[PDB]
Amino acid sequence: CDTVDLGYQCSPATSHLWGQYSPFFSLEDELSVSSKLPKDCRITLVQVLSRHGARYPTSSKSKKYKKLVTAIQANATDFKGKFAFLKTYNYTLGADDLTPFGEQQLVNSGIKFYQRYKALARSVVPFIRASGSDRVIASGEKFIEGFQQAKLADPGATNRAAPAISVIIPESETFNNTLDHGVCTKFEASQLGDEVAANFTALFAPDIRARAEKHLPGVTLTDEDVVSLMDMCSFDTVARTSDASQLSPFCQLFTHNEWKKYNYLQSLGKYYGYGAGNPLGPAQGIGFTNELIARLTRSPVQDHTSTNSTLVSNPATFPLNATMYVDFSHDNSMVSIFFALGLYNGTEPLSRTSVESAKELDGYSASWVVPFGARAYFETMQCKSEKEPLVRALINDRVVPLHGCDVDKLGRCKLNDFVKGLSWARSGGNWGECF
Ligand SMILES: *[C@@H]1O[C@H](CO)[C@@H](O)[C@H](O)[C@H]1NC(C)=O
Ligand SMILES: *[C@@H]1O[C@H](CO)[C@@H](O)[C@H](O)[C@H]1NC(C)=O
Ligand SMILES: *[C@@H]1O[C@H](CO)[C@@H](O)[C@H](O)[C@H]1NC(C)=O
Ligand SMILES: *[C@@H]1O[C@H](CO)[C@@H](O)[C@H](O)[C@H]1NC(C)=O
Ligand SMILES: *[C@@H]1O[C@H](CO)[C@@H](O)[C@H](O)[C@H]1NC(C)=O
Ligand SMILES: *[C@H]1O[C@H](CO)[C@@H](O)[C@H](O)[C@H]1NC(C)=O
Protein backbone atom coordinates (compact mmCIF):
# COMPACT_ATOMS: atom_id res chain seq x y z
CA CYS A 1 0.00 0.00 0.00
CA ASP A 2 2.87 2.31 0.89
CA THR A 3 5.85 2.83 -1.43
CA VAL A 4 8.98 4.93 -1.30
CA ASP A 5 8.04 7.08 -4.26
CA LEU A 6 4.27 7.47 -3.97
CA GLY A 7 3.57 7.08 -0.27
CA TYR A 8 0.24 5.59 0.82
CA GLN A 9 -2.11 4.67 -2.01
CA CYS A 10 -4.58 2.20 -0.56
CA SER A 11 -8.20 3.18 -0.12
CA PRO A 12 -7.48 6.79 -1.28
CA ALA A 13 -11.15 7.82 -1.13
CA THR A 14 -10.80 7.39 2.64
CA SER A 15 -7.12 7.43 3.61
CA HIS A 16 -6.26 10.74 1.99
CA LEU A 17 -9.10 12.37 3.99
CA TRP A 18 -7.74 12.01 7.53
CA GLY A 19 -5.96 15.37 7.77
CA GLN A 20 -2.80 15.14 9.86
CA TYR A 21 -3.71 11.49 10.46
CA SER A 22 -3.39 10.62 6.78
CA PRO A 23 -0.27 8.66 5.87
CA PHE A 24 1.89 10.71 3.48
CA PHE A 25 0.78 10.39 -0.14
CA SER A 26 2.85 11.92 -2.92
CA LEU A 27 1.42 15.08 -4.49
CA GLU A 28 3.85 15.01 -7.42
CA ASP A 29 2.16 16.91 -10.30
CA GLU A 30 -0.97 17.66 -8.27
CA LEU A 31 -2.04 21.26 -8.98
CA SER A 32 1.63 21.67 -9.73
CA VAL A 33 4.42 21.40 -12.26
CA SER A 34 6.79 18.42 -11.95
CA SER A 35 9.12 18.36 -8.97
CA LYS A 36 11.89 17.01 -11.19
CA LEU A 37 15.23 18.77 -11.17
CA PRO A 38 15.03 21.13 -14.19
CA LYS A 39 17.26 20.67 -17.19
CA ASP A 40 20.81 22.02 -16.74
CA CYS A 41 20.31 22.60 -13.01
CA ARG A 42 22.35 21.22 -10.15
CA ILE A 43 21.30 21.18 -6.50
CA THR A 44 23.78 23.06 -4.26
CA LEU A 45 21.93 22.84 -0.93
CA VAL A 46 18.91 20.98 0.34
CA GLN A 47 17.08 21.39 3.63
CA VAL A 48 14.58 18.71 4.64
CA LEU A 49 11.91 19.33 7.27
CA SER A 50 10.19 16.05 8.21
CA ARG A 51 7.36 15.18 10.57
CA HIS A 52 7.55 12.07 12.65
CA GLY A 53 5.83 8.96 11.24
CA ALA A 54 2.45 7.38 11.94
CA ARG A 55 1.87 6.88 15.66
CA TYR A 56 -0.49 5.73 18.35
CA PRO A 57 -2.85 8.29 19.89
CA THR A 58 -1.25 10.50 22.56
CA SER A 59 -1.64 9.17 26.10
CA SER A 60 -4.57 11.54 26.78
CA LYS A 61 -6.38 10.71 23.52
CA SER A 62 -5.76 7.00 23.94
CA LYS A 63 -7.41 7.19 27.40
CA LYS A 64 -10.38 9.03 25.88
CA TYR A 65 -10.81 6.52 23.05
CA LYS A 66 -10.59 3.48 25.30
CA LYS A 67 -13.15 5.09 27.65
CA LEU A 68 -15.53 5.55 24.75
CA VAL A 69 -15.17 2.07 23.28
CA THR A 70 -15.67 0.60 26.79
CA ALA A 71 -18.82 2.70 27.36
CA ILE A 72 -20.23 1.71 23.98
CA GLN A 73 -19.65 -1.98 24.74
CA ALA A 74 -21.22 -1.56 28.23
CA ASN A 75 -24.33 0.35 27.04
CA ALA A 76 -25.24 -1.14 23.64
CA THR A 77 -28.05 -3.73 23.67
CA ASP A 78 -27.33 -4.45 20.01
CA PHE A 79 -24.61 -3.72 17.42
CA LYS A 80 -26.40 -3.28 14.11
CA GLY A 81 -25.20 -3.29 10.52
CA LYS A 82 -21.76 -1.81 9.92
CA PHE A 83 -21.38 -1.25 13.69
CA ALA A 84 -21.60 -5.04 14.27
CA PHE A 85 -17.82 -5.37 14.75
CA LEU A 86 -17.96 -3.24 17.94
CA LYS A 87 -19.63 -6.16 19.76
CA THR A 88 -16.21 -7.93 19.81
CA TYR A 89 -13.68 -5.18 19.01
CA ASN A 90 -10.85 -5.09 21.51
CA TYR A 91 -9.09 -1.78 22.11
CA THR A 92 -5.32 -2.50 22.14
CA LEU A 93 -3.69 0.74 20.92
CA GLY A 94 -0.74 2.17 22.76
CA ALA A 95 0.22 5.75 23.32
CA ASP A 96 2.54 8.26 21.70
CA ASP A 97 4.97 5.85 20.07
CA LEU A 98 5.52 5.24 16.36
CA THR A 99 3.76 2.23 14.94
CA PRO A 100 5.74 -0.18 12.76
CA PHE A 101 4.07 1.35 9.70
CA GLY A 102 5.18 4.81 10.86
CA GLU A 103 8.76 3.60 11.33
CA GLN A 104 8.77 2.23 7.78
CA GLN A 105 7.36 5.50 6.44
CA LEU A 106 10.49 7.18 7.75
CA VAL A 107 12.88 4.52 6.41
CA ASN A 108 11.14 5.07 3.05
CA SER A 109 11.52 8.83 3.38
CA GLY A 110 15.28 8.46 3.94
CA ILE A 111 15.56 6.16 0.90
CA LYS A 112 13.62 8.66 -1.20
CA PHE A 113 15.79 11.57 0.00
CA TYR A 114 18.97 9.71 -0.98
CA GLN A 115 17.57 8.77 -4.39
CA ARG A 116 16.27 12.26 -5.13
CA TYR A 117 19.53 13.97 -4.11
CA LYS A 118 21.98 11.23 -5.04
CA ALA A 119 24.47 13.54 -6.74
CA LEU A 120 25.12 15.38 -3.46
CA ALA A 121 24.32 12.55 -1.08
CA ARG A 122 27.07 10.34 -2.50
CA SER A 123 29.68 12.49 -0.73
CA VAL A 124 27.69 14.32 1.96
CA VAL A 125 26.84 13.36 5.50
CA PRO A 126 23.76 15.52 6.28
CA PHE A 127 23.62 17.65 9.42
CA ILE A 128 20.59 16.43 11.42
CA ARG A 129 18.57 17.80 14.31
CA ALA A 130 15.44 16.50 16.02
CA SER A 131 12.99 17.99 18.42
CA GLY A 132 13.13 16.28 21.86
CA SER A 133 10.15 13.98 21.49
CA ASP A 134 10.75 10.23 21.50
CA ARG A 135 8.66 9.61 18.36
CA VAL A 136 10.50 12.42 16.57
CA ILE A 137 13.95 11.09 17.54
CA ALA A 138 12.87 7.59 16.56
CA SER A 139 11.65 8.95 13.22
CA GLY A 140 15.05 10.57 12.66
CA GLU A 141 16.81 7.31 13.39
CA LYS A 142 14.58 5.47 10.89
CA PHE A 143 15.17 8.13 8.19
CA ILE A 144 18.92 7.66 8.76
CA GLU A 145 18.53 3.89 8.41
CA GLY A 146 16.81 4.38 5.05
CA PHE A 147 19.33 6.95 3.86
CA GLN A 148 22.20 4.63 4.75
CA GLN A 149 20.51 1.65 3.11
CA ALA A 150 20.10 3.51 -0.15
CA LYS A 151 23.66 4.90 0.07
CA LEU A 152 25.11 1.38 0.60
CA ALA A 153 23.23 0.11 -2.49
CA ASP A 154 24.79 2.88 -4.60
CA PRO A 155 28.25 1.90 -5.95
CA GLY A 156 28.92 5.57 -6.67
CA ALA A 157 28.82 6.66 -3.04
CA THR A 158 32.21 7.77 -1.70
CA ASN A 159 31.39 8.84 1.99
CA ARG A 160 29.24 6.32 3.78
CA ALA A 161 29.79 7.57 7.36
CA ALA A 162 26.37 7.42 9.05
CA PRO A 163 24.98 10.83 10.07
CA ALA A 164 24.14 11.13 13.70
CA ILE A 165 21.34 13.18 15.13
CA SER A 166 23.71 15.97 16.21
CA VAL A 167 21.26 18.10 18.17
CA ILE A 168 18.20 17.06 20.13
CA ILE A 169 16.33 20.24 21.04
CA PRO A 170 14.52 20.04 24.35
CA GLU A 171 10.75 20.43 24.50
CA SER A 172 9.90 22.76 27.40
CA GLU A 173 7.82 25.87 27.86
CA THR A 174 11.13 27.66 28.62
CA PHE A 175 13.44 26.25 25.94
CA ASN A 176 13.60 28.16 22.65
CA ASN A 177 13.04 25.36 20.09
CA THR A 178 12.42 26.20 16.40
CA LEU A 179 11.14 22.63 15.81
CA ASP A 180 8.47 22.69 18.54
CA HIS A 181 6.46 25.71 19.64
CA GLY A 182 6.08 26.55 23.28
CA VAL A 183 7.61 29.81 24.54
CA CYS A 184 5.11 32.34 23.07
CA THR A 185 2.88 32.68 26.13
CA LYS A 186 -0.09 34.42 24.53
CA PHE A 187 -0.16 31.91 21.68
CA GLU A 188 -0.04 28.86 23.95
CA ALA A 189 -3.13 30.18 25.75
CA SER A 190 -5.07 30.67 22.48
CA GLN A 191 -8.40 28.84 22.22
CA LEU A 192 -9.25 29.89 18.66
CA GLY A 193 -8.36 26.66 16.85
CA ASP A 194 -10.26 24.51 19.37
CA GLU A 195 -13.28 26.83 19.20
CA VAL A 196 -13.35 26.76 15.39
CA ALA A 197 -13.05 22.97 15.41
CA ALA A 198 -15.83 22.62 18.01
CA ASN A 199 -18.15 24.91 16.06
CA PHE A 200 -17.58 23.06 12.82
CA THR A 201 -18.05 19.67 14.50
CA ALA A 202 -21.42 20.90 15.86
CA LEU A 203 -22.53 21.43 12.22
CA PHE A 204 -21.71 17.96 10.86
CA ALA A 205 -21.72 15.55 13.79
CA PRO A 206 -25.47 15.50 14.70
CA ASP A 207 -26.57 13.42 11.69
CA ILE A 208 -23.73 10.97 12.25
CA ARG A 209 -24.52 10.68 15.97
CA ALA A 210 -28.16 9.94 15.15
CA ARG A 211 -27.22 7.13 12.79
CA ALA A 212 -24.68 5.64 15.17
CA GLU A 213 -27.15 5.80 18.11
CA LYS A 214 -29.74 4.03 15.92
CA HIS A 215 -27.30 1.16 15.28
CA LEU A 216 -26.13 1.07 18.92
CA PRO A 217 -29.39 1.13 20.91
CA GLY A 218 -28.64 2.05 24.53
CA VAL A 219 -25.71 4.32 23.62
CA THR A 220 -25.56 8.09 23.92
CA LEU A 221 -22.88 9.88 21.89
CA THR A 222 -21.69 13.48 22.02
CA ASP A 223 -20.29 15.40 19.03
CA GLU A 224 -16.86 14.75 20.55
CA ASP A 225 -17.52 10.98 20.55
CA VAL A 226 -18.36 11.08 16.85
CA VAL A 227 -14.96 12.67 16.17
CA SER A 228 -13.28 10.08 18.43
CA LEU A 229 -14.84 7.24 16.41
CA MET A 230 -13.70 8.87 13.17
CA ASP A 231 -10.16 9.41 14.59
CA MET A 232 -10.10 5.64 15.34
CA CYS A 233 -10.25 4.83 11.63
CA SER A 234 -6.81 6.27 11.01
CA PHE A 235 -5.23 5.21 14.29
CA ASP A 236 -6.49 1.64 14.06
CA THR A 237 -5.44 1.38 10.41
CA VAL A 238 -1.86 2.47 11.06
CA ALA A 239 -1.57 0.18 14.08
CA ARG A 240 -3.34 -3.05 13.23
CA THR A 241 -0.92 -4.27 10.52
CA SER A 242 2.74 -3.53 10.04
CA ASP A 243 2.17 -2.13 6.56
CA ALA A 244 -1.24 -0.49 7.13
CA SER A 245 -2.56 -2.87 4.46
CA GLN A 246 -6.03 -3.37 5.99
CA LEU A 247 -8.46 -0.50 6.54
CA SER A 248 -9.83 -0.43 10.04
CA PRO A 249 -13.49 -1.50 10.49
CA PHE A 250 -14.05 2.02 11.99
CA CYS A 251 -13.50 3.51 8.53
CA GLN A 252 -16.62 2.15 6.79
CA LEU A 253 -18.88 3.48 9.59
CA PHE A 254 -18.62 6.89 7.86
CA THR A 255 -19.35 7.85 4.26
CA HIS A 256 -17.02 9.44 1.73
CA ASN A 257 -18.92 12.70 2.14
CA GLU A 258 -18.43 12.52 5.92
CA TRP A 259 -14.68 11.87 5.37
CA LYS A 260 -14.47 15.03 3.34
CA LYS A 261 -16.01 16.90 6.30
CA TYR A 262 -13.60 15.24 8.73
CA ASN A 263 -10.65 16.10 6.49
CA TYR A 264 -11.82 19.75 6.44
CA LEU A 265 -12.29 19.79 10.21
CA GLN A 266 -8.62 18.83 10.47
CA SER A 267 -7.64 21.56 7.96
CA LEU A 268 -9.57 24.11 10.03
CA GLY A 269 -7.86 23.04 13.25
CA LYS A 270 -4.41 23.50 11.74
CA TYR A 271 -5.25 26.73 9.88
CA TYR A 272 -6.89 28.44 12.86
CA GLY A 273 -4.56 26.79 15.39
CA TYR A 274 -1.15 27.21 13.76
CA GLY A 275 -1.50 28.80 10.32
CA ALA A 276 -2.60 32.25 9.12
CA GLY A 277 -5.99 31.87 10.76
CA ASN A 278 -4.29 32.33 14.15
CA PRO A 279 -2.99 35.84 14.86
CA LEU A 280 0.22 34.34 16.37
CA GLY A 281 0.31 31.14 14.28
CA PRO A 282 2.86 32.02 11.61
CA ALA A 283 5.01 33.73 14.29
CA GLN A 284 5.76 30.24 15.68
CA GLY A 285 7.59 29.56 12.41
CA ILE A 286 9.79 32.65 12.34
CA GLY A 287 12.69 31.05 14.25
CA PHE A 288 13.06 28.18 11.76
CA THR A 289 12.59 30.59 8.87
CA ASN A 290 15.55 32.62 10.10
CA GLU A 291 17.60 29.45 10.57
CA LEU A 292 16.76 28.53 6.97
CA ILE A 293 17.79 31.99 5.77
CA ALA A 294 21.12 31.56 7.64
CA ARG A 295 21.67 28.23 5.90
CA LEU A 296 20.66 29.49 2.45
CA THR A 297 23.01 32.50 2.77
CA ARG A 298 25.78 30.78 4.73
CA SER A 299 25.51 33.61 7.31
CA PRO A 300 24.93 33.91 11.06
CA VAL A 301 21.35 33.54 12.25
CA GLN A 302 19.52 36.80 12.92
CA ASP A 303 16.49 36.05 15.09
CA HIS A 304 14.95 37.05 18.42
CA THR A 305 11.98 34.71 18.50
CA SER A 306 12.34 30.94 19.14
CA THR A 307 16.00 30.38 18.25
CA ASN A 308 18.41 29.65 21.06
CA SER A 309 21.41 31.96 20.67
CA THR A 310 23.78 29.40 22.20
CA LEU A 311 22.68 26.72 19.76
CA VAL A 312 22.81 28.86 16.60
CA SER A 313 26.19 30.45 17.47
CA ASN A 314 28.17 27.23 17.80
CA PRO A 315 29.34 25.51 14.58
CA ALA A 316 28.97 22.13 16.31
CA THR A 317 25.22 22.64 16.73
CA PHE A 318 24.57 24.95 13.76
CA PRO A 319 27.12 24.65 10.96
CA LEU A 320 26.65 27.20 8.19
CA ASN A 321 28.18 25.17 5.33
CA ALA A 322 26.88 21.53 5.61
CA THR A 323 25.16 21.38 2.16
CA MET A 324 22.47 18.90 3.34
CA TYR A 325 20.37 19.52 6.46
CA VAL A 326 17.55 17.35 7.84
CA ASP A 327 15.33 18.45 10.75
CA PHE A 328 12.68 16.34 12.48
CA SER A 329 9.59 18.00 13.92
CA HIS A 330 5.81 17.93 14.41
CA ASP A 331 2.72 18.81 12.38
CA ASN A 332 1.86 21.96 14.29
CA SER A 333 5.29 23.55 14.10
CA MET A 334 5.60 22.57 10.43
CA VAL A 335 2.27 24.33 9.65
CA SER A 336 3.51 27.50 11.34
CA ILE A 337 6.83 27.31 9.48
CA PHE A 338 5.20 26.87 6.07
CA PHE A 339 2.97 29.89 6.73
CA ALA A 340 5.88 32.00 8.06
CA LEU A 341 7.73 31.23 4.81
CA GLY A 342 4.75 32.65 2.89
CA LEU A 343 4.14 29.36 1.08
CA TYR A 344 0.36 29.54 1.55
CA ASN A 345 -0.02 33.23 0.77
CA GLY A 346 -2.37 32.30 -2.06
CA THR A 347 -4.82 30.72 0.40
CA GLU A 348 -7.77 32.81 1.55
CA PRO A 349 -9.07 32.42 5.10
CA LEU A 350 -10.93 29.14 5.32
CA SER A 351 -14.71 29.14 5.48
CA ARG A 352 -15.90 28.00 8.88
CA THR A 353 -19.13 26.52 7.39
CA SER A 354 -18.37 25.28 3.86
CA VAL A 355 -15.85 22.62 2.93
CA GLU A 356 -13.38 23.87 0.32
CA SER A 357 -10.96 21.29 -1.20
CA ALA A 358 -7.18 21.69 -1.26
CA LYS A 359 -7.75 22.44 -4.97
CA GLU A 360 -9.88 25.45 -4.05
CA LEU A 361 -7.56 26.53 -1.19
CA ASP A 362 -4.46 26.79 -3.43
CA GLY A 363 -3.02 23.50 -2.25
CA TYR A 364 -3.63 23.91 1.50
CA SER A 365 -5.06 21.06 3.59
CA ALA A 366 -3.87 19.21 6.64
CA SER A 367 -3.53 15.98 4.59
CA TRP A 368 -1.62 17.71 1.74
CA VAL A 369 0.67 19.63 4.09
CA VAL A 370 1.22 17.71 7.35
CA PRO A 371 0.29 14.06 6.91
CA PHE A 372 2.00 11.41 9.03
CA GLY A 373 5.58 11.34 7.68
CA ALA A 374 5.19 14.73 6.00
CA ARG A 375 8.31 16.13 4.38
CA ALA A 376 9.35 19.42 2.80
CA TYR A 377 12.42 19.96 0.66
CA PHE A 378 13.88 23.47 0.36
CA GLU A 379 16.36 23.50 -2.53
CA THR A 380 18.98 25.85 -3.81
CA MET A 381 19.99 25.05 -7.36
CA GLN A 382 22.46 26.57 -9.79
CA CYS A 383 20.96 26.55 -13.28
CA LYS A 384 22.63 27.46 -16.58
CA SER A 385 19.52 29.58 -17.29
CA GLU A 386 20.21 32.07 -14.49
CA LYS A 387 23.32 33.58 -12.96
CA GLU A 388 21.86 33.68 -9.44
CA PRO A 389 21.02 30.60 -7.34
CA LEU A 390 17.34 29.65 -7.49
CA VAL A 391 15.23 28.43 -4.55
CA ARG A 392 12.40 25.90 -4.78
CA ALA A 393 10.04 24.45 -2.15
CA LEU A 394 8.54 20.97 -2.41
CA ILE A 395 5.90 20.00 0.15
CA ASN A 396 5.06 16.29 -0.02
CA ASP A 397 6.42 16.34 -3.56
CA ARG A 398 4.18 19.21 -4.73
CA VAL A 399 5.99 22.32 -5.98
CA VAL A 400 4.70 25.14 -3.83
CA PRO A 401 5.40 28.37 -5.64
CA LEU A 402 7.19 30.97 -3.54
CA HIS A 403 5.51 34.21 -2.48
CA GLY A 404 7.05 37.58 -1.83
CA CYS A 405 9.45 37.41 -4.77
CA ASP A 406 9.45 37.35 -8.57
CA VAL A 407 8.47 33.73 -9.03
CA ASP A 408 9.05 31.86 -12.31
CA LYS A 409 6.76 29.29 -14.00
CA LEU A 410 8.61 26.49 -12.20
CA GLY A 411 7.83 28.00 -8.79
CA ARG A 412 11.30 29.36 -8.14
CA CYS A 413 12.79 32.67 -7.06
CA LYS A 414 16.33 33.96 -7.13
CA LEU A 415 17.91 33.46 -3.67
CA ASN A 416 18.43 37.09 -2.67
CA ASP A 417 14.95 38.00 -3.94
CA PHE A 418 13.39 35.16 -1.88
CA VAL A 419 15.25 36.24 1.27
CA LYS A 420 14.23 39.85 0.73
CA GLY A 421 10.58 38.79 0.42
CA LEU A 422 10.77 37.15 3.86
CA SER A 423 10.89 40.65 5.45
CA TRP A 424 8.19 39.75 8.00
CA ALA A 425 10.14 36.85 9.45
CA ARG A 426 13.42 38.74 9.19
CA SER A 427 11.94 41.51 11.35
CA GLY A 428 10.57 39.11 13.98
CA GLY A 429 6.96 39.65 12.78
CA ASN A 430 4.49 40.18 15.61
CA TRP A 431 6.44 38.14 18.15
CA GLY A 432 6.19 40.98 20.67
CA GLU A 433 2.47 40.19 21.01
CA CYS A 434 3.50 36.88 22.67
CA PHE A 435 4.17 38.75 25.89
C1 LIG B 1 19.66 27.74 25.24
O1 LIG B 1 20.44 26.55 25.13
C2 LIG B 1 21.34 26.46 26.22
C3 LIG B 1 22.33 25.32 25.93
O2 LIG B 1 21.59 24.14 25.82
C4 LIG B 1 20.55 26.31 27.52
O3 LIG B 1 21.45 26.21 28.61
C5 LIG B 1 19.60 27.49 27.75
O4 LIG B 1 18.73 27.35 28.87
C6 LIG B 1 18.75 27.66 26.48
N1 LIG B 1 17.92 28.83 26.65
C7 LIG B 1 16.70 28.91 26.10
C8 LIG B 1 15.85 30.06 26.52
O5 LIG B 1 16.30 28.06 25.27
C1 LIG C 1 -18.76 29.59 17.36
O1 LIG C 1 -20.10 29.84 17.02
C2 LIG C 1 -20.69 30.89 17.75
C3 LIG C 1 -22.19 30.89 17.43
O2 LIG C 1 -22.32 30.76 16.03
C4 LIG C 1 -20.01 32.20 17.37
O3 LIG C 1 -20.52 33.26 18.16
C5 LIG C 1 -18.50 32.12 17.59
O4 LIG C 1 -17.87 33.25 17.02
C6 LIG C 1 -17.93 30.84 16.98
N1 LIG C 1 -16.53 30.70 17.36
C7 LIG C 1 -15.55 30.83 16.46
C8 LIG C 1 -14.17 31.11 17.01
O5 LIG C 1 -15.71 30.73 15.24
C1 LIG D 1 -23.39 4.74 29.04
O1 LIG D 1 -24.38 4.81 30.06
C2 LIG D 1 -24.02 5.67 31.14
C3 LIG D 1 -25.01 5.52 32.29
O2 LIG D 1 -26.29 5.94 31.86
C4 LIG D 1 -23.96 7.10 30.65
O3 LIG D 1 -23.66 8.02 31.69
C5 LIG D 1 -22.93 7.21 29.52
O4 LIG D 1 -23.04 8.48 28.94
C6 LIG D 1 -23.21 6.16 28.46
N1 LIG D 1 -22.14 6.23 27.47
C7 LIG D 1 -22.32 5.87 26.19
C8 LIG D 1 -21.15 6.04 25.26
O5 LIG D 1 -23.37 5.39 25.77
C1 LIG E 1 14.74 32.85 23.94
O1 LIG E 1 13.78 33.62 23.21
C2 LIG E 1 13.42 34.87 23.81
C3 LIG E 1 12.41 35.58 22.89
O2 LIG E 1 11.42 34.66 22.68
C4 LIG E 1 14.61 35.78 23.96
O3 LIG E 1 14.21 36.87 24.78
C5 LIG E 1 15.76 35.05 24.62
O4 LIG E 1 16.90 35.85 24.45
C6 LIG E 1 16.03 33.67 23.99
N1 LIG E 1 17.11 32.98 24.68
C7 LIG E 1 18.13 32.38 24.06
C8 LIG E 1 19.20 31.71 24.89
O5 LIG E 1 18.22 32.38 22.84
C1 LIG F 1 2.45 36.49 3.36
O1 LIG F 1 1.30 37.25 3.72
C2 LIG F 1 1.38 37.92 4.95
C3 LIG F 1 0.01 38.57 5.22
O2 LIG F 1 -0.27 39.42 4.12
C4 LIG F 1 2.51 38.93 4.93
O3 LIG F 1 2.62 39.54 6.21
C5 LIG F 1 3.83 38.23 4.60
O4 LIG F 1 4.89 39.15 4.45
C6 LIG F 1 3.67 37.43 3.31
N1 LIG F 1 4.88 36.64 3.03
C7 LIG F 1 5.61 36.68 1.93
C8 LIG F 1 6.86 35.84 1.96
O5 LIG F 1 5.32 37.33 0.93
C1 LIG G 1 30.86 23.55 8.05
O1 LIG G 1 31.47 24.53 8.87
C2 LIG G 1 30.87 24.59 10.13
C3 LIG G 1 31.04 26.04 10.64
O2 LIG G 1 29.97 26.90 10.26
C4 LIG G 1 31.52 23.43 10.90
O3 LIG G 1 31.01 23.26 12.21
C5 LIG G 1 31.38 22.08 10.16
O4 LIG G 1 32.62 21.38 10.22
C6 LIG G 1 30.89 22.14 8.68
N1 LIG G 1 29.61 21.46 8.47
C7 LIG G 1 29.46 20.13 8.33
C8 LIG G 1 30.33 19.45 7.30
O5 LIG G 1 28.63 19.47 8.98
Coordinates of all heavy atoms in Angstrom, one line a residue, residues 8 25 67 74 85 109 115 184 208 229 235 268 310 353 383 398 414:
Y8 N 1.3 6.5 0.5 CA 0.2 5.6 0.8 C -0.9 5.7 -0.2 O -1.5 6.8 -0.3 CB -0.2 5.9 2.2 CG -1.2 4.8 2.8 CD1 -0.7 3.6 3.3 CD2 -2.5 5.0 2.8 CE1 -1.5 2.6 3.8 CE2 -3.4 4.1 3.3 CZ -2.9 2.9 3.8 OH -3.7 1.9 4.3
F25 N 1.0 10.8 1.2 CA 0.8 10.4 -0.1 C 1.4 11.5 -1.0 O 1.2 12.7 -0.8 CB -0.7 10.2 -0.4 CG -1.6 11.3 0.0 CD1 -2.1 12.3 -0.9 CD2 -2.1 11.4 1.3 CE1 -2.9 13.3 -0.5 CE2 -2.9 12.4 1.7 CZ -3.3 13.4 0.8
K67 N -12.0 4.8 26.8 CA -13.1 5.1 27.6 C -14.4 5.0 26.8 O -15.4 4.4 27.2 CB -13.0 6.5 28.3 CG -14.3 7.0 29.1 CD -14.2 8.4 29.4 CE -15.0 8.8 30.6 NZ -15.9 10.0 30.3
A74 N -20.5 -1.4 27.0 CA -21.2 -1.6 28.2 C -22.7 -1.2 28.1 O -23.6 -1.7 28.8 CB -20.6 -0.8 29.3
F85 N -19.2 -5.0 14.3 CA -17.8 -5.4 14.8 C -17.5 -4.9 16.2 O -16.7 -5.5 16.8 CB -16.7 -4.9 13.8 CG -16.3 -3.4 14.0 CD1 -15.2 -3.1 14.7 CD2 -17.1 -2.4 13.4 CE1 -14.9 -1.8 14.9 CE2 -16.7 -1.1 13.6 CZ -15.6 -0.8 14.4
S109 N 11.2 7.4 3.6 CA 11.5 8.8 3.4 C 13.0 9.1 3.3 O 13.5 9.9 2.4 CB 10.9 9.7 4.5 OG 11.1 11.1 4.3
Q115 N 17.8 9.0 -3.0 CA 17.6 8.8 -4.4 C 17.4 10.1 -5.1 O 17.9 10.3 -6.2 CB 16.4 7.8 -4.7 CG 16.7 6.4 -4.2 CD 15.5 5.4 -4.3 OE1 15.7 4.2 -4.2 NE2 14.3 6.0 -4.5
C184 N 5.9 31.2 23.3 CA 5.1 32.3 23.1 C 3.8 32.3 23.9 O 2.8 31.6 23.6 CB 4.8 32.3 21.6 SG 3.7 33.7 21.1
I208 N -24.5 12.2 12.1 CA -23.7 11.0 12.3 C -24.1 10.3 13.6 O -24.2 9.1 13.7 CB -22.2 11.3 12.1 CG1 -21.9 12.0 10.8 CG2 -21.4 10.0 12.3 CD1 -20.5 12.3 10.6
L229 N -14.6 8.4 17.2 CA -14.8 7.2 16.4 C -14.2 7.4 15.0 O -13.7 6.4 14.5 CB -16.3 6.9 16.3 CG -17.0 6.5 17.6 CD1 -18.5 6.4 17.4 CD2 -16.5 5.1 18.0
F235 N -6.1 5.8 13.3 CA -5.2 5.2 14.3 C -5.2 3.7 14.3 O -4.2 3.1 14.3 CB -5.5 5.8 15.7 CG -5.1 7.2 15.9 CD1 -6.0 8.2 16.1 CD2 -3.7 7.4 15.9 CE1 -5.5 9.5 16.2 CE2 -3.2 8.7 16.2 CZ -4.1 9.7 16.3
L268 N -9.2 23.0 9.2 CA -9.6 24.1 10.0 C -8.8 24.2 11.3 O -8.3 25.2 11.7 CB -11.1 24.1 10.4 CG -12.1 24.4 9.3 CD1 -13.5 24.0 9.7 CD2 -12.0 25.9 9.0
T310 N 22.7 30.3 22.0 CA 23.8 29.4 22.2 C 23.8 28.3 21.1 O 24.9 28.0 20.6 CB 23.7 28.8 23.6 OG1 23.8 29.8 24.6 CG2 24.9 27.9 23.9
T353 N -17.9 27.3 7.6 CA -19.1 26.5 7.4 C -19.1 25.6 6.2 O -19.9 24.6 6.1 CB -20.3 27.5 7.3 OG1 -20.0 28.5 6.2 CG2 -20.4 28.3 8.5
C383 N 21.4 26.9 -11.9 CA 21.0 26.5 -13.3 C 21.7 27.4 -14.3 O 22.1 28.5 -14.1 CB 19.5 26.9 -13.4 SG 18.4 25.9 -12.3
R398 N 4.8 18.1 -4.0 CA 4.2 19.2 -4.7 C 5.1 20.4 -4.7 O 5.6 20.9 -3.7 CB 2.8 19.5 -4.1 CG 2.0 20.6 -4.8 CD 0.7 20.8 -4.3 NE 0.0 21.8 -5.1 CZ -0.1 23.1 -4.8 NH1 0.3 23.6 -3.6 NH2 -0.7 23.9 -5.7
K414 N 14.9 33.7 -7.4 CA 16.3 34.0 -7.1 C 16.5 34.1 -5.6 O 15.7 34.6 -4.9 CB 16.8 35.2 -7.8 CG 16.8 35.1 -9.3 CD 17.1 36.4 -10.0 CE 16.0 37.4 -10.0 NZ 14.7 37.0 -10.7

